[PDB]
Amino acid sequence: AEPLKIALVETLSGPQASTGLLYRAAVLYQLGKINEAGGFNGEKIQILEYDNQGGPVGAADRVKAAIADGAQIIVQGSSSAVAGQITEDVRKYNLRNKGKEVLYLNLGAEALELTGSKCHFYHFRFSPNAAIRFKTVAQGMKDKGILGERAYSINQNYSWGVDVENTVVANAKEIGYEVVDKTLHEVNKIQDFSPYVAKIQAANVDTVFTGNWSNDLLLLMKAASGAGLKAKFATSFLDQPGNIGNAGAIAEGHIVSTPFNPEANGEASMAFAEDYKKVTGHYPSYVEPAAVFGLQLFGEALKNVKPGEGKINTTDIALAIENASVKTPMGDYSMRSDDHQAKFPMVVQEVSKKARIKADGTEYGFLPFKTFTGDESIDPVQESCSMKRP
Numbered sequence: 058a059e060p061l062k063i064a065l066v067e068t069l070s071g072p073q074a075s076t077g078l079l080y081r082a083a084v085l086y087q088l089g090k091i092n093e094a095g096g097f098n099g100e101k102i103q104i105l106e107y108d109n110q111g112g113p114v115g116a117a118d119r120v121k122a123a124i125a126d127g128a129q130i131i132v133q134g135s136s137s138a139v140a141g142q143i144t145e146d147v148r149k150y151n152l153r154n155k156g157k158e159v160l161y162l163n164l165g166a167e168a169l170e171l172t173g174s175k176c177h178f179y180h181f182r183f184s185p186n187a188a189i190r191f192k193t194v195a196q197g198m199k200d201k202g203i204l205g206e207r208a209y210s211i212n213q214n215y216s217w218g219v220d221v222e223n224t225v226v227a228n229a230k231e232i233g234y235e236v237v238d239k240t241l242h243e244v245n246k247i248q249d250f251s252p253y254v255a256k257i258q259a260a261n262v263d264t265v266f267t268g269n270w271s272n273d274l275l276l277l278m279k280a281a282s283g284a285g286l287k288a289k290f291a292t293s294f295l296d297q298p299g300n301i302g303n304a305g306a307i308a309e310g311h312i313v314s315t316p317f318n319p320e321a322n323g324e325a326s327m328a329f330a331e332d333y334k335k336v337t338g339h340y341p342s343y344v345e346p347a348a349v350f351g352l353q354l355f356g357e358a359l360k361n362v363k364p365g366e367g368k369i370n371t372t373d374i375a376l377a378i379e380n381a382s383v384k385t386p387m388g389d390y391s392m393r394s395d396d397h398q399a400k401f402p403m404v405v406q407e408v409s410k411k412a413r414i415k416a417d418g419t420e421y422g423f424l425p426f427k428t429f430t431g432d433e434s435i436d437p438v439q440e441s442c443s444m445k446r447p
């Protein structure tokens with residue numbers, strides 16, 4: 058029997074590897090569970106790791122190496138720029154090597170193009186995307202009565218920030234808010250956000266939507282606190298590890314929408330968090346739940362694949378993913394065939410002292426206040442995705 062070989066292509070060493078190493082932990086955790094159940098095709102699944110130190114260009118080289126080493130599946134998630142390279146190199150390879158197609162399981166790259174203008178049959182996204190993040194965070198705040206009528210959009214000036222801005226603008230009419238002004242700023246360089254905060258203060262808004270991460274999120278929220286800006290921040294990345302530890306009371310009351318919260322589904326979500334901590338050493342945070350749950354859906358798909366003469370057929374695997382659904386610790390996970398965007402619940406959360414599980418050793422944690430089903434969470438199919446089918 059031919060074993061299934063899955064290549065993890067991630068930043069796996071050095072000072073920039075924090076997020077890649079969380080993907081590694083989630084991948085080894087859930088592929089470990091699938092191997093505990095017997096693997097695939099009567100053999101354990103082999104996990105091949107490729108440390109990419111070279112960004113998009115390095116990823117092209119590592120994808121070539123993985124395929125040459127016999128991987129039939131590539132997994133990655135820490136960078137949309139790298140994901141855009143992987144998904145196109147995989148698509149191009151597949152077109153030129155009919156019958157030998159490789160799958161790309163995208164476990165966390167959230168740029169809209171991956172299920173839109175770059176969508177294709179051998180890519181599957183198991184994580185949120187910009188539209189899911191910001192439609193659900195806005196709707197959750199609207200439903201709770203804390204959104205207000207006036208909003209500001211502030212994001213980083215690259216593909217991700219543009220996707221977030223476009224989403225926030227597009228949903229204003231339907232959800233019921235006004236985007237008073239919008240700003241795109243330099244990426245991961247600004248130390249003093251006070252001039253941007255002054256503009257937001259002048260706009261007299263209730264809510265600030267931002268897809269910012271790391272310093273661009275934290276230093277912006279801190280400048281807002283120092284200036285007495287009263288608006289709530291509506292974010293996608295407030296729960297990066299360390300953010301609450303570094304912001305403390307400055308983060309209290311601000312909002313994030315994510316696929317998981319350990320308090321959001323009673324014993325099921327707690328038991329998962331404790332099991333994950335037993336295996337990996339930490340509670341599953343940030344990017345890890347979506348990667349685990351996506352690989353849970355993947356494992357369910359494998360269970361439903363019929364083996365033919367012991368050779369692995371990635372087209373059969375892709376069709377099985379389209380058809381699969383699994384109950385995760387957060388509820389039902391399935392896959393949309395039109396664009397291969399996964400359908401799954403989203404939990405809108407507030408930083409609060411009243412959360413039972415604390416973040417970063419502080420008095421604060423993420424308190425869940427609204428859960429949307431997958432049907433309520435998934436974004437509309439983009440007019441730009443036209444997927445050629447086998």
Ligand SMILES: [K+]
Pocket residue numbers: 198199200201202203204205
């Ligand atoms: K409201």
